[PDB]
Amino acid sequence: DITELSEIELEASVLQEIEALEKLIKEQSLSALQRALIALKDARSKLEKYET
Amino acid sequence: DITELSEIELEASVLQEIEALEKLISLSALQRALIALKDARSKLEKYE
Numbered sequence: 001d002i003t004e005l006s007e008i009e010l011e012a013s014v015l016q017e018i019e020a021l022e023k024l025i026k027e028q029s030l031s032a033l034q035r036a037l038i039a040l041k042d043a044r045s046k047l048e049k050y051e052t
Numbered sequence: 053d054i055t056e057l058s059e060i061e062l063e064a065s066v067l068q069e070i071e072a073l074e075k076l077i078s079l080s081a082l083q084r085a086l087i088a089l090k091d092a093r094s095k096l097e098k099y100e
Contacts, residue, residue: 002079002083002086002087003079003083007082010082010083010086011082013086014082014085014086014089017086017089017090017093018089020093021089021092021093021096024093024096024097024099024100025096028055030054030055032082033062033063033066033081033082033085034054034055034057034062036066036082036085036086036089037054037062037065037066037069037085038054039089040066040069040070040073040085040088040089040092041069043073043089043092043093043096044069044072044073044076044092046096046099047073047076047077047092047095047096047099048076050099051076051077051095052075052076
């Protein structure tokens with residue numbers, strides 16, 4: 001279940017999903033939510049070539 | 053750059069992308085992102 005995850009577990013789970021999605025498709029380290037935005041944008045860009 | 057976005061701008065941007073994905077294929081934005089990433093991954097397997 002998603003809502004039972006702690007905030008830190010939710011971040012980890014998001015990152016794991018991003019890694020899987022990447023297998024398919026000054027300086028500042030990114031947070032999970034920042035990485036999620038990039039990954040969602042990448043997924044949308046690819047899907048829009050095939051769908052709707 | 054993505055790090056220039058405030059937390060509100062980041063959340064708003066994430067929900068905008070999720071909305072766009074919903075058209076193609078309670079909770080916080082990060083929870084919604086997890087759901088949307090799982091759904092997008094499942095759909096992208098046929099386009100790898």
